[PDB]
């Protein structure tokens, strides 16, 4: 009664009460209510473990609802209506059913015993970690949210151990097990189910990043260098020579050079490379139309920008229709609003709108020459966004992601240090160079130039002794206190969360792979055609059932049984080590001696 899950289940029965929602009655807690609350505990996934529909609509059984002839919000296939349903034999997950019930009640010692006899070990452990993490977050305010989070981390390590034991032997089947769906859990394939728990440790362990580097670099290899694929990228003949290493090539499956070229282009690595080249060339094109093509009319090289902005903005509309909920149109845009980089992109679009009005109006060319220059770097921030890729830069740019608000902190700090003596530099000396908006130059603009080399010594230099005194004073606090002390709070904070930053980049790596995998390899110059390809398709088609290009690997019964039986044998093998690890721990061996001596005090009083 004092548990949070019981309180949640004491509310769903009231949010859907007897009269208005579960129209016959609903004062009895039945399995559809717990399925509904578990789905809220879970994410936006498929139907949860217990049957929702008219076959087993378990909400409205206290009033004389009709028998088998009804089959609507009642009993259809079960035997009798005796204020119950009948024998729904096992619902194909009898162990996970107890596992969830033990987890929601926060029974730490009980849940581990039930987890041992589980069938789908990894998926169950990952689901338990997510449910524990999200139940800890809701409400008790102390002493059990911490304990729930600790148990969630314990189950995380428990799953990592089983996955490591399964991955050590025959990694090929381990990877296939990683991406399989699980009918007993509302599929939630393990890789997808892991992300919503945010799973810092599980995603960063070995074979996970190996599979991520396997889906990326799709069909070519994992050994070829990055600098050697870019040459074959631009030289189209150079693909056909013996320089790059495919997987079709070792199996000599090259019966059509166009086919192996398609296998080359379908890989996400070259889609990313071609997109980054297109985005790098679009900035050069935009620079072209500002140095020479400064005209008040749409010229030959101007409608290209219009079509480019048309093409890139439609990627977001494609993503809006990618994997939404079929009822929430505004509730899906919230997570787009939750990403400040998406806000930066839409702001760069809005800044383009604000600058185009000045571009088309001939009387405001000068304001349009200074309001679009900042856009060139507002797009450079976005181009920096997509460089969360490199092994030595990704975990390195995640550091400046920690720097971001402190970037503004130090900018506001250092600008004030600069101005504090920029005001005092021109005070004692009698400066007389003044104009309209150019007295400001010789008053303030020449203060920052005197910091990094541009010191007018013949102008800046009786008060020569004080000029030495104050010039040494500024650089004593900046080049000593404001330059070298940053290194301390850079390097120490770098050491602070380096483990976090390493695994955060490991966790954030899947997001880049997710976006670029389910996408055609056509150039953004050629995505314009594919933007209409699914539109002409909907002239003939009417329902969104084109294809599912997700990981989502479905498996047959003959291989599912041949894989789950393999995992169970490895799960018990892993349980050998931890059970042996506990007894080998020196602290635990102190338990063994202590309770054995306690068996001696009672053994020698029989005289």
């Amino acid at each position: 009664p004092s548990c949070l899950f019981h309180s949640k289940l004491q509310k769903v029965l009231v949010e859907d009460p007897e009269r208005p929602a579960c129209a016959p009655a609903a004062p009895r807690l039945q399995m559809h209510h717990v399925a509904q609350v578990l789905r809220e505990l879970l994410g936006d996934f498929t139907q949860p473990l217990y049957p929702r529909p008219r076959h087993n609509d378990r909400l409205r059984l206290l009033l004389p609802v009709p028998h088998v002839k009804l089959n609507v919000q009642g009993v259809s296939l079960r035997s009798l209506y005796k204020r119950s349903s009948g024998h729904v034999t096992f619902t194909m997950d009898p162990i996970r059913d107890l596992l969830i019930w033990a987890i929601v009640q926060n029974r730490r010692e009980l849940a581990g015993i039930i987890w041992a006899q589980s069938q789908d070990c990894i998926a169950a452990a990952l689901a338990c970690s997510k449910i524990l993490k999200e139940l800890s977050k809701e409400e008790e305010d102390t002493d059990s949210s911490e304990e729930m989070l600790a148990l969630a981390e314990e189950y995380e390590h428990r799953a990592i151990g089983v996955f490591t034991e399964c991955y050590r032997k025959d990694e090929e089947r381990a990877q296939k097990l990683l991406t399989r769906v699980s009918e007993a859990w509302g599929k939630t394939t393990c890789l997808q189910l892991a992300l919503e728990a945010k799973d810092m440790k599980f995603v960063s362990h070995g074979g996970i990043q190996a599979f991520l580097t396997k889906v990326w670099w799709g069909q070519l290899s994992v050994d070829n260098g990055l600098w050697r694929v870019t040459l074959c990228m631009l030289a189209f003949p150079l693909l056909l020579t013996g320089l790059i290493s495919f997987r079709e090539k070792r199996l000599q499956d090259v019966g059509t050079p166009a086919a192996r070229a398609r296998a080359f282009f379908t890989a996400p690595v070259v889609v990313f490379h071609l997109n980054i080249l297109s985005y790098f060339a679009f900035l050069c094109l935009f620079a072209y139309v500002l140095m020479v093509d400064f005209q008040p009319v749409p010229s030959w090289c101007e409608c290209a920008i219009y079509l480019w902005l048309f093409s890139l903005v439609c990627e977001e509309m494609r993503q809006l229709f990618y994997d939404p909920d079929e009822c929430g149109l505004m509730k899906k845009a919230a997570l787009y609003f939750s990403d400040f980089w998406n806000k930066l992109d839409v702001g760069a679009i809005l800044l383009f709108v604000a600058g185009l009005t000045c571009r088309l109006i001939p009387a405001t060319l000068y304001p349009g020459r200074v309001i679009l220059s900042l856009d060139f770097i507002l797009f450079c921030l976005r181009l920096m966004h997509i460089f969360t890729i490199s092994k030595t830069l990704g975990p390195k740019i995640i550091i400046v992601k920690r720097m971001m608000k402190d970037v503004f902190f130090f900018l506001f700090l250092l600008a004030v240090w600069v101005v504090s003596f920029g005001v005092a530099k021109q005070a004692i000396l009698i400066h007389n160079e003044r104009r309209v908006d150019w007295l400001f130059r010789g008053a303030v603009y020449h203060s920052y130039l005197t910091i990094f080399g541009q010191i007018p010594g013949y102008i800046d230099g009786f008060p020569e002794w004080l000029t030495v005194l104050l010039l040494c004073l500024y650089l004593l606090f900046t080049n000593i206190l404001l330059l070298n002390l940053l290194i301390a709070m850079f390097n120490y904070t770098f050491q602070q969360v380096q483990e976090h930053t390493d695994q955060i980049w490991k966790f954030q790596r899947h997001d880049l792979i997710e976006e670029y995998h389910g996408r055609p390899a056509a150039p953004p110059p050629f995505i314009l055609l594919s933007h209409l390809q699914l539109f002409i398709k909907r002239v003939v088609l009417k329902t969104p059932a084109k294809r599912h290009k997700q990981l989502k690997n479905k498996l047959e019964k003959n291989e599912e049984a041949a894989l789950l039986s393999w995992e169970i044998y490895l799960k018990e093998n892993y349980l050998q080590n931890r059970q042996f690890q506990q007894k080998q721990r020196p602290e635990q061996k102190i338990e063994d001696i202590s309770n054995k001596v306690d068996a001696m005090v009672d053994l020698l009083d029989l005289d």
Partner: protein, 75 residues
């Protein structure tokens, strides 16, 4: 059970006379009965007796008699 799924198991083979079996009527199958189900019951134990549920292998010697005791010692 306490070995916690340790490698290898203590193999045990049981030898009993085929005559003194309670529910052997369901065990007889004209074809190869690789699948089979035997349910034990300690209620209807007359001169007969039930089998053990822990032996890994079973050998049933028959001699034509029904209630004979000791048709397994010499074999």
């Amino acid at each position: 059970l306490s070995s916690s799924y340790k490698e290898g198991e203590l193999i045990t083979i049981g030898v009993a006379t085929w005559g003194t079996v309670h529910r052997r009527e369901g065990l007889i199958h004209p074809t190869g009965s690789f699948p089979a189900e035997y349910i034990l019951d300690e209620d209807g134990q007359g001169n007969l007796t039930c089998l053990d549920s822990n032996h890994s292998h079973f050998i049933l010697v028959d001699d034509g008699t029904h209630g004979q005791y000791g048709v397994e010692i010499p074999l």
